[PDB]
Curated annotation (Swiss-Prot), chains A, C:
Keyword Nucleotide-binding: yes
Identification of the protein by name: Actin, alpha skeletal muscle
EC number: 3.6.4.-
Modified residues (Tele-methylhistidine): 73
Residue numbers carrying Methionine (R)-sulfoxide: 44, 47
Remarks, miscellaneous: In vertebrates 3 main groups of actin isoforms, alpha, beta and gamma have been identified. The alpha actins are found in muscle tissues and are a major constituent of the contractile apparatus. The beta and gamma actins coexist in most cell types as components of the cytoskeleton and as mediators of internal cell motility.
UniProtKB/Swiss-Prot annotation, chain B:
The Myosin motor domain, residue ranges: 1-643
Localization annotation: Cytoplasm, Myofibril
Originating species: Gallus gallus (Chicken)
Subunit structure as annotated in this protein's UniProt entry: Muscle myosin is a hexameric protein that consists of 2 heavy chain subunits (MHC), 2 alkali light chain subunits (MLC) and 2 regulatory light chain subunits (MLC-2).
Protein name: Myosin heavy chain, skeletal muscle, adult
Origin organism lineage: Eukaryota, Metazoa, Chordata, Craniata, Vertebrata
Functional description taken from the UniProt entry: Muscle contraction. Myosin is a protein that binds to F-actin and has ATPase activity that is activated by F-actin.
Length: 372, 643, 372
């Protein structure tokens, strides 16, 4: 129990932090990855002067603060502001003292060696956690779907990745990163919806375009004869009621937004798209492992939640793969937390105890120890 | 720790620790308060006699006439330390050793109403019935603080007195912990020694009929409610109260019981409160010189004044029950305040006054896993009192090194505490932020909280964010007092600090047939002019703006009175939670010592020249060393001697 | 008590001064904002030659003096004559000595920086008050209705304003000023009442048209079919008895006067009206704060006292606002003193002590100190 209860799992994202206790089924804490700094001197009624704001209080009060994102494209870019988000996570969100809890953290696919050593330096030397561990994100997603070999298409708020994993070892030279994700996708909907003849003028109009994207957006299979369908004008249309009455209608654009993930050309991107990239990762891997990867395309991440994403991907890679092959696109329902759940499982596991980096290992080996 | 302990196991309760006069609860009887002792300690420096309270108390007197300065005695300790006892005992002392009403001295209804020396005395037993109760620690715990000014004459004979009350435990009136009980009065009255009373008030003799007063315990073996009732009764009289008033008091004390019996129910299909009967209201109404109806309306359909008019507002069941309770408490309090005033009034003589001796009885810094508003107020009081000492000592010390000719330079010892005090009492400090937000019609405890931080956090050292775990219950803010770190919970503060009262009702009181009741409310009725419309400032018409706005004013008027005084200190101690004579838990006494000031006086002593002997205390004990030449020195000049 | 009793609250208006002690429920002193200067040399029986007259003695003796208004449209226009009204307030009306009383003053919505510094210069340097503070008027009105975010429609004698306030900070760029108020409104009634076939010939006829406006005027909801109602001639009519017998009747015009506040076109004004202006203020604010402002339209000022003003405004903005919105028009009964009461509360408050500008701050920082 000492640490069975006690292991923490913190998944640091570009848009959201997911956090909680190893053992739980889902994150106890989910909140924006921002750190707000007040543009002016003054106070809220009853509070003192605050130097900084994090998560939702930074989002809610955004009009008087300069908002900053510590993690650009999955990599920690500002370490002063990240130690601020961690502090908030332990002390306010989970309300635990960190110096008696083992902490499993996550990093990104080709996270620079030096960063994995730096967050270890900050975990052990400024938070004084007993022990910690850094798992790679795609690797926890795979594992949370039971398996050990597969290829994960991972897509969240600032990055998309393909991480081919074989008997647990993520394959460095076959990993692909595509910098277009849910953030890019909300801003494109924004324009095709103002372009539908609308105005997201106040900040209460801006924010909810993102809630339109999440609730009403679709990834149609045969996106071709779906536009064609749009035109005959079926009961395909969908009206959403705004903060007030102002019933906005979205028929068609509803799927023009996730067609951006297959066609980056919709947004002036010259890069290849999700399905081709799944494939290219795969023809960059060893030959003998390619049947395995093809029958185990695990999807994780908030942006892979658009319904019919899996069917489109299913047919997208069948028709690029040699017919002798078995294609299989696994997309679980909890996928917006796969990464986290994979960490919860792993860290609550009976056999993981012997991989925890302890302060004994650290004080004796330097940050190098956990770096592997 | 060890010295105290040893002389206790030997049954010596009075040991000095510098200027202090430590006192340990015997938990049994002693010939110390002995009528022989009283004399013995009469005219003796504390070096001519062993450690005892009359030493302090006499010296004060002495000093009073010798230096022509006013004096003070500061008694302080935890709930079970037994201060009242001392306080009282000190008081008798004064009365005895310097009375002489000449005519009042005869054995003809001696000490009955009609003399002060008695009034002076009789005072206590009234206040005690109303401001005292069975605590889980004491059986007669003081649920309020107090300050008496014994105004001595020119000659040196008694002339006047002056009481002042601070921080009354309003909550007892409505609540009570499981092993405790409410004020005595209630139990006194239902005791049945004066059966008329029962019928007069319209109550029964079984307390379980009055929820407000039987939530905890009803009877205490060591107390004879029947005897007290008279004590109380008789005291009132001596105190010069009018029968009528003496009738108001009673009648008023029963109304309050009744209130807690007032019941309500939800109007059908409505979320409104509607009276669940006019059985009790009737009694409460009559007893207060009110009208049942008018009363139940005001209560249910509070008619407010938002904007420039008076808007009738509807309340919920939960809202009523709570408002009622608010008046119950409000009324009791006020009354209590009044009684004090009335007492003071009798204790007013025309004879000239040249000096006084103030006897202050209040609580000491207590730390609880749970510290709320009330704790801050008290702690703040103490942290002030402490600085008050640290300074007196600095002043004092420095005289010696000046008298002797030593060359020692040092900074005021008070200074160390100024940091904490400013943070509380200064303008952008806690109280202010507390009392401002109270002006915001839509503020939250949470609101208040943030304001507290944004402004003090990171910028102030004594200011800190809590340590939520250990024996503590939640988080909000810790402070760094001299005694240590106190973890404060801010929840209810805003309210508690606003003293919200249904003004419609108060209206009724204001026009009662029961003058006294009418009186008690006057000062509320005279400030309404000032807070006529919604929002704004109550003070415009003389209404309190803060729960804390006075406390401060009173605490200032006090600490000022304390200054034009020659401070005399007394620290009361509590041996063991278990109530056993000749015993002591260590850490329990240790605690007190830190929060007492005792350990801080030792510190300041040790900076330096630790042990410091008072001259007579020096003569006596050591004359024998060069017997001839040291005795001559000590006798020939109390000081020059030791030299 | 030192200053608990001692704080003064002076609300300077275009028509009236409201003054008194922080703590009181309503102003101890209310009087016209005039300064009369005698047109001829001479005396009243028993008095000496008087150079000047202020408040009601200037109004009562108006036939031999030249009357002047120091505050034009809420802004102090003549500083010689204002120091005269302040002097009168302290010394004669409240009969206090100012050099031992903290003074909370009020200013108007976009009061020029230089003025807030000038009245501070005069408060501290010619009246020698211990400390002072200048609150913005709409902001005290809001606060006196308990809240901290809302939009105040403030309307008195020379100006109307809309001041959107968010967590206490009045929003400069969203504030609207409409120069038509109770003064304009008494003069329009005047004409529709002479136009009813009457004569307000002597000065005892002039003054009482204003007391007709206050007592008998209404703001009807559906002002349309209220004129229609007037015609069928119901018992809608209302006769007022003049200083003498001369019973004057006012049926209809009774509401034609406050319909001027919604239709400025009744008086040759081309500006928009109260309700549209409430709204425009609101579509000039941030988007996310617009639901707050809509559920918190606080009204204050003598001219917003016309019964049924709130119902008309209620329906006026519901029908301009998106139906998804909650409208809420708060109009308290004491509203002709909201501003003052908000100051009384605030200045008697426990937490305000640390915002008082003291002579220490001033003698050391210059007028800049209080200017913020």
């Amino acid at each position: 129990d000492e640490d069975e209860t006690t292991a923490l799992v913190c998944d640091n994202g570009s848009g959201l932090v997911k956090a909680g206790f190893a053992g739980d089924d889902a994150p106890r804490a989910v909140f924006p990855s921002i750190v707000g700094r007040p543009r002016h001197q003054g106070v809220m009624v009853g509070m003192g002067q605050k130097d900084s704001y994090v998560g939702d209080e930074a989002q809610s009060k955004r009009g008087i603060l300069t908002l900053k994102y510590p993690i650009e494209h999955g990599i920690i870019t500002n370490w002063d502001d990240m130690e601020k988000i961690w502090h908030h996570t332990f002390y306010n969100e989970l309300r635990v003292a960190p110096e008696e809890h083992p902490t499993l953290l996550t990093e990104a696919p080709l996270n620079p060696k030096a960063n994995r050593e730096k967050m270890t330096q900050i975990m052990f030397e400024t938070f004084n956690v007993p022990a910690m561990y850094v798992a790679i994100q795609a690797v926890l997603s795979l594992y949370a779907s039971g398996r050990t070999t597969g290829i994960v298409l991972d897509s969240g708020d600032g990055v998309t990745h393909n991480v081919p994993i074989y008997e647990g070892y993520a394959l460095p030279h076959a990993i692909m990163r595509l910098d277009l994700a849910g953030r890019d996708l909300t801003d494109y909907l924004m324009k095709i919806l103002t372009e539908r003849g609308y105005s997201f003028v106040t900040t209460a109009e801006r924010e909810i375009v993102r809630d339109i994207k999440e609730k009403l957006c679709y990834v149609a299979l045969d996106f071709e004869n779906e536009m064609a369908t749009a035109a005959s004008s079926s009961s395909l249309e969908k009206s959403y009621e705004l903060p007030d009455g102002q019933v906005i209608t979205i028929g068609n654009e509803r799927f023009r937004c996730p067609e951006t993930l297959f066609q980056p050309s919709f947004i002036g991107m010259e890069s290849a798209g999700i399905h081709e990239t799944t494939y290219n990762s795969i023809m960059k891997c060893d030959i003998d492992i390619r049947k395995d990867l093809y029958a185990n395309n695990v999807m994780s991440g908030g942006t892979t939640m658009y319904p019919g994403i899996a069917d489109r991907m299913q047919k997208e890679i069948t028709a690029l793969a040699p017919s002798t092959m078995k294609i299989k696109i696994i997309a679980p329902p909890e996928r917006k937390y796969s990464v986290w759940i994979g960490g919860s499982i792993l860290a609550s596991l009976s056999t993981f105890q012997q991989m925890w980096i302890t302060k004994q290992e650290y004080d004796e080996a330097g940050p190098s120890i956990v770096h592997r | 720790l060890y010295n105290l302990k040893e002389r206790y196991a030997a049954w010596m309760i009075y040991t000095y620790s510098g200027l202090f006069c430590v006192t340990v609860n015997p938990y049994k009887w002693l010939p110390v308060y002995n009528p022989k002792v009283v004399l013995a300690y009469r005219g003796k420096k504390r070096q001519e006699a062993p450690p005892h309270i009359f030493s302090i108390s006499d010296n004060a007197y002495q000093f009073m006439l010798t230096d022509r300065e006013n004096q003070s005695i500061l008694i302080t300790g935890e709930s079970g330390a037994g201060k009242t006892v001392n306080t009282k005992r000190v008081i008798q002392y004064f009365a005895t050793i310097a009375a002489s009403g000449e005519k009042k001295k005869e054995e003809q209804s001696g000490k009955m109403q009609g003399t002060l020396e008695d009034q002076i005395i009789s005072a206590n037993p009234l206040l005690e019935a109303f401001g005292n109760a069975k605590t889980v620690r004491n059986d007669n715990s003081s649920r309020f603080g107090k300050f008496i000014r014994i105004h001595f004459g020119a000659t040196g004979k008694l002339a006047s007195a002056d009481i002042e009350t601070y921080l009354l435990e309003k909550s007892r009136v409505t609540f009570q912990l499981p092993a405790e009980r409410s004020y005595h009065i209630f139990y006194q009255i239902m005791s049945n020694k004066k059966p008329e009373l029962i019928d007069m008030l319209l109550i029964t003799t079984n307390p379980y009929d009055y929820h407000y007063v039987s939530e905890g315990e009803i009877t205490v073996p060591s107390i004879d409610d029947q005897e007290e009732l008279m004590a109380t009764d008789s005291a009132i009289d001596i105190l010069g109260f009018s029968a009528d008033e003496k009738t108001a008091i009673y009648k008023l004390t029963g109304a309050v019981m009744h209130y807690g019996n007032l019941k309500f129910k939800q109007k059908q299909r409505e979320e409104q409160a509607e009276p669940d009967g006019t059985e009790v209201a009737d009694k409460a109404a009559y007893l207060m010189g009110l009208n049942s109806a008018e009363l139940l309306k005001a209560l249910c359909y509070p008619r407010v004044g938002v904007g420039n008019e008076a808007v009738t507002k509807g309340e919920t069941v939960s809202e009523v029950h709570n408002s009622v309770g608010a008046l119950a408490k409000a009324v009791y309090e006020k009354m209590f305040l009044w009684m004090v005033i009335r007492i003071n009034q009798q204790l007013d003589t025309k004879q000239p006054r040249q000096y006084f001796i103030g006897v202050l009885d209040i609580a000491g810094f207590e730390i609880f896993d749970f510290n709320s508003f009330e704790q801050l107020c008290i702690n703040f009081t103490n942290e002030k009192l402490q600085q008050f000492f640290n300074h007196h000592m600095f002043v004092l010390e420095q005289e010696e090194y000046k008298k002797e000719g030593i060359e020692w330079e040092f900074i005021d010892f008070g200074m160390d505490l100024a940091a904490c005090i400013e943070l509380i009492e200064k303008p952008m400090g806690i109280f202010s932020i507390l009392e401002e937000e109270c002006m915001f019609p839509k503020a939250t405890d949470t609101s208040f909280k943030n304001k507290l931080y944004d402004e003090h956090l990171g910028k102030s050292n004594n200011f800190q964010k809590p340590k939520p775990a250990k024996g503590k219950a939640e988080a909000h803010f810790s402070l760094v007092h001299y005694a240590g770190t106190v973890d404060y919970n801010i929840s209810g503060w805003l309210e508690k600090n606003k003293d919200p009262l249904n003004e419609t009702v108060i209206g009724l009181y204001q026009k009662s047939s029961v003058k006294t009741l009418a009186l008690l409310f006057a000062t509320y009725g005279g400030e309404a002019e000032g807070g006529g419309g919604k929002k704004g400032g109550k003070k415009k018409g003389s209404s309190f703006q803060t729960v804390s706005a006075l406390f401060r004013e009173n605490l200032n008027k006090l600490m000022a009175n304390l200054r034009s005084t020659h401070p005399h200190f007394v620290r009361c101690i509590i041996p063991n939670e278990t109530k056993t004579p000749g015993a002591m838990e260590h850490e329990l006494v240790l605690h007190q010592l830190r929060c007492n000031g005792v350990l801080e006086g030792i510190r300041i002593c040790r900076k330096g020249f630790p042990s410091r002997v008072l001259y007579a205390d020096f003569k006596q004990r050591y004359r024998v060393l060069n017997a001839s030449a040291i005795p001559e020195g000590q006798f020939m000049d109390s000081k020059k001697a030791s030299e």
